[PDB]
Design a protein around this ligand. Structure first.
Ligand code: HEC
Ligand code: HEC
Ligand code: HEC
Ligand SMILES: [Cu+2]
Ligand SMILES: [Cu+2]
Ligand SMILES: [Cu+2]
Ligand SMILES: [Cu+2]
Ligand SMILES: [Cu+2]
Ligand SMILES: [Cu+2]
Lengths: 456, 456, 456
């Protein structure tokens, strides 16, 4: 007998309602197998991969990851793929969980402006990645062509308070991390498995700040977690919490009470979380430079009463979360646009710099620039800053050590170089500082920084 | 008590019959512990790692992976390692599953032209990697010195219709992927874990096309899957199917009903597959640039009747499998040899280009060069191609965008650069196209392409 | 109900006794929940990451990994973090296993010369990584800021004969592997996940030779194994043995009878080993260039009677373990210091070269330099060596092939290049050889090698 042998489809054909991340369709809530009609459209479009950084994404349903599909084991799925006429590339689909060559790939080949269809029976319960399977496949996947399909067990999953959809991917831009402008795909970095960004849900900050996932103390949360790759394996982890359950694909095995779990490239898992105490819980790839240097962080924010018997401490802040502690970094987007338009004002720079100062600089110099006397020198009303703005550019790029005097006090410490900051970021940060805390005002330009970077 | 305590060896000494990949020795089919004599010979030799690409492999038994060894838990194994007189390096062996320092390494050190032996009891059931353990060990492993030993449980494994032997490895050549000639090992790429090839069974195409694994609808297939490394961890996956069972080494844990599973460097697993519907099922490392850009694909081809209730779609083709959809790429080998000999003909180039055109170019331009009017321009009887062959070289290497006119119709799309193609590959592809579909004939040489690559 | 609901703390407050690697605190041996006071101090200090190679480590408790903390599920932990006044950076802590945002991070922020405290209930049994969580977090982790906390189940873990503490990390120096001197952290290699060293317990040789872990035949050994990362996933493996049990974090799953197991970045596991036969058992990351080219090897040395029925072979030697077979490589440290001081003698070089010759050269040329007539030429009383010392430098760096005559016998083989050896290493090795085995004496300097490396 084949698995999923629940007989022919019955009832009426069901048009599947698909959802955009990070939301999930409702439970199927059905006791009979059905014919389920799935309609998905490929759209190629520019979107912001980071503030001020555009990328040409290739998408299933207009999002990265693509629309979530939810069916029942034993269903007959009539899958329709449409390729929007604006597309330049052909596309197709391989759904993990399909029983048949290519997971649908040969029969779903769809040129721009065309449609295709194929039918499969969902024999296999589980959570599964789907992705494009069009040569060059790695390029298509790298450009965002992946999503999740859930094939429910016949009785449904246990009830929870919230269900969310989170998918990791690695991305390959010609430019470096946070370098502004429309960034091409970089095939050489992709072949070498050297991503410039590693993201949840297609963008930096997609699930942080005002875009966080939400729940309340006492509630249960199920997260459908994909790893589209193309190349990286996620050391997937929740900061400050534990997973009650982790189940990979449709596996019989269920691990319970783990905090860190390896998700293969192309893999998927269902995790369950129970909210205990309020605050922000961070989903990360614990290959930690991905999480804290390339974008791979997402937030589940829990509302409710503190329990000092369980945890006496404070909510997360910019020391750990960096510049993603805040609701958003919209000022960076605005300043980048203003630079393109040739209308960049001092205030545009100040507000972008404010956003970027958090964590990056405030960890040592404090959010108010006061530092810590004799330990971390002040940026507030700083004589040393005022005396030489070009020196300040060199300090950000190249670091500073040795004995200095600031506001009448000696320091003898080490500020590491921060050369990974882009010219606009340094410029904006320093313009923020110059226009705060009784400093002398004025501005630093990206071009000013470019010149210092070329001659330390 | 130690595990495997089934008493002293009984019966007669058994000379083990070892098999070359992808075949496996028969089940031991024995109820008593034996003394098993294993004889393995190291041979260093050039073989083709890809068509026209030679490599000096170091082998156990003349193959990569090395010969498969099959014994029973509780057996006493008298292991004999011989190092062929033609060898330049000394060699030895570490068998995972051996209880004792180095897994045999110190007592198996064997200079060229020598032999060694040691004896161990197989206490531990499971599937296990063996490999060379001679300084510099990573070099020996990278050169192909790894294989599998199966230690059966006393009652044997459950009966299946087919057993196969598949082992992943990462390889490090001085040249780039598909660059022709005898390629040295590259220690710098090896230390950086930046392989040029990632392969099953020692070569591109080792298990594709006419070298695929076979079974029929309804049959069960057990695959002994190794990962020799040296360095990579496989996101091991079957496209279009599921694994009934995955069991690592001799672990008590068995995962069931998973499609994607992580195999450590040095690790091994036993997977089971049940054939449901006909077609080609692809074993891959789903760190997908390895599978589709570096060689890490293998095929299990299933014969039998379609079942439209389960899968309505078609067999895999070159859109997904690329140039490995075909039975073989022997024409590439032949053309590379003819170049070396100084006898390369137009037809030699045409037949190599034909092989290389599949997927790489046909995904957009079609197998007949017709394209799709207004979407993908024709290569068949193409005025634009004929008008400027050097332009065509530049388009392959460097891409093309913007409005063009071909055969009286405007196109306004994007052909990505294909700079990873080697000079001979571009030359051969374009010579194929020029000599097909009423195009004007002639040829493009590797030297012609080299010149365009040096000045875009 | 929350997990760990064993009621309020009772008895007296307990001041936790923390241990330095590779030792573990005693079992808590307690049937009631307690208030446990933990005091940990951050110290930034230079230590030797390899012989003659200094690094500025940032530590919890003065060691890498940091001090081991051992508590009972259901305990209330009052955690005190102090930052030594000599520190330049602020620090904090995220303990995996803590229920609360950041795992303690916001409330543990501690500037140099300050202290902080927070309280948490240990709801979650398991073995857990702790680490610094101060921007830039990856830098702090890379500099050594990680350790383990064990939260025992209420009944305690089963009794074993020995408990040890082993933690992997990846490290990023500006210089190459084994390049001498004080090495800065390299942010570019860290972001690219390209470590120069991969170590157990903070240094090359930390757990080899005279620093090996010990047990006797018949004894059980539990190892608490961490992977601090920041970035790598360990293919964690024991050479020549098997793990009776592997349990990750506080997971319900326990794998039994495996040799190779994947430990995520940030992950931890408890493994159990039973000693069967004497000799050295190697813990490695089986992404094997890490183990054999970057430092990722540790030894469990078992004392007792051989059992020829189980294993007939010899103890590990330098063929497999390389230059870590010996008790230590102190002579390298001494020679590097003498170079810095300008007092380097011939004998200083000879003794450093002796240490470095093992495995690296002896695998082929033998420990006595005799080679194997006609196969591996002698370095003992070698006419060919004596005839041209600069040629010998070129051979080490750049290899040698083709027909040569040494001591009246022809060789026609291949010595691979060894360009990864640093100038001082080549110099010292060759000075050792020149001053051994009736060779002519004299010396080779690092500067001599530098010149040959610049012009092959
Ligand atoms: C802690 C790790 C720091 C971070 C992050 C940043 N800075 Fe810093 N800064 C730090 C120290 C210890 C010092 C003094 C070094 C010494 O030689 O003793 C400094 C110094 C500066 C200065 C100059 C002095 C002053 O005006 O107070 C400037 C202008 C400065 N730092 C700016 C700055 C900015 C803009 C940062 C974010 C990009 C930043 N610093 C981070 C320590 C640390
Ligand atoms: C789809 C992703 C493509 C692949 C793969 C290949 N080509 Fe292509 N090609 C494509 C487009 C959309 C265009 C037109 C670009 C525009 O500006 O609108 C082209 C064009 C060419 C041409 C020139 C026009 C013609 O003669 O039809 C040539 C000679 C050409 N392409 C060759 C070619 C070859 C040999 C390829 C495999 C190496 C190949 N193309 C791949 C789209 C795509
Ligand atoms: C086996 C893989 C080797 C290792 C490791 C090392 N050497 Fe070697 N060496 C080897 C061979 C096969 C040869 C001869 C090459 C040929 O063309 O046939 C050599 C040669 C030398 C020589 C010159 C000849 C001599 O004096 O015997 C020297 C000086 C030499 N080798 C030194 C040397 C040192 C110092 C090494 C460790 C750094 C070393 N070799 C490693 C094979 C192998
Ligand atoms: Cu696509
Ligand atoms: Cu896939
Ligand atoms: Cu070998
Ligand atoms: Cu091994
Ligand atoms: Cu720190
Ligand atoms: Cu962590």
């Amino acid at each position: 007998k084949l698995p999923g042998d629940f007989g022919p489809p019955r009832g009426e054909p069901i048009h599947a309602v698909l959802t955009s991340p990070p939301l999930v369709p409702p439970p199927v809530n059905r006791t009979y197998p059905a014919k389920v009609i799935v309609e998905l459209e490929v759209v190629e479009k520019e979107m912001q991969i980071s503030e001020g950084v555009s990328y040409t994404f290739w998408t299933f349903g207009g999002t990265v990851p693509g629309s979530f599909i939810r069916v029942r084991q034993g269903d007959t799925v009539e899958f329709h793929l449409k390729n929007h006429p604006s597309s330049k590339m052909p596309h197709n689909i391989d759904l993990h969980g399909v029983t048949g060559p290519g997971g649908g790939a040969a029969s779903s080949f769809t040129a721009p402006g065309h449609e295709s269809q194929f039918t499969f029976k969902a024999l296999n319960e589980g959570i599964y990645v789907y992705h494009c399977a069009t040569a060059p496949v790695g390029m298509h996947i790298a450009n965002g062509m992946y999503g999740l399909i859930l094939v429910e067990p016949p009785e449904g999953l246990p009830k929870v308070d919230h269900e969310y959809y989170v998918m990791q991917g690695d991305f390959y831009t010609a430019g470096k991390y946070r370098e502004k402008g429309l960034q091409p795909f970089d095939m050489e970095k992709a072949i070498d498995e050297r991503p410039s960004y590693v993201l949840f849900n297609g963008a930096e900050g997609a699930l942080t700040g005002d875009k966080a996932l939400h729940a309340k103390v006492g509630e249960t949360v199920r997260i459908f977690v994909g790893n589209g790759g193309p190349n990286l394996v996620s050391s997937f982890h929740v900061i400050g919490a534990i997973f009650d359950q982790v189940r990979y694909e449709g596996g019989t095995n269920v691990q319970k009470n783990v905090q860190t779990t390896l998700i293969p490239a192309g893999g998927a898992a269902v995790v369950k979380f129970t909210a205990r105490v309020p605050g922000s819980y961070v989903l990360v790839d614990h290959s930690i430079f991905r999480a804290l240097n390339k974008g791979a962080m997402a937030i589940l924010k829990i509302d409710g009463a503190e329990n000092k018997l369980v945890y006496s401490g404070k909510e997360l802040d910019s020391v750990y979360l960096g510049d993603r502690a805040a609701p958003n970094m919209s000022a960076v987007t605005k300043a980048t646009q203003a630079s393109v338009s040739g209308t960049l004002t001092v205030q545009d720079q100040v507000q972008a710099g404010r956003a970027l100062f958090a964590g990056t600089c405030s960890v040592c110099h404090q959010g108010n620039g006061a530092g810590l006397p004799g330990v971390f020198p002040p940026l507030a009303k700083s004589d040393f800053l005022a005396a030489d703005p070009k020196r300040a550019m060199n300090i950000v790029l190249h670091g500073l050590n040795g004995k200095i005097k600031v506001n009448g006090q000696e320091y003898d410490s080490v500020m590491p170089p921060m050369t990974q900051l882009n010219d606009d970021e340094v410029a904006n940060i320093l313009t923020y500082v110059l226009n705060s805390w009784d400093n002398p005002g004025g501005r630093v330009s990206a071009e000013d920084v470019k010149k210092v970077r070329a001659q330390p």
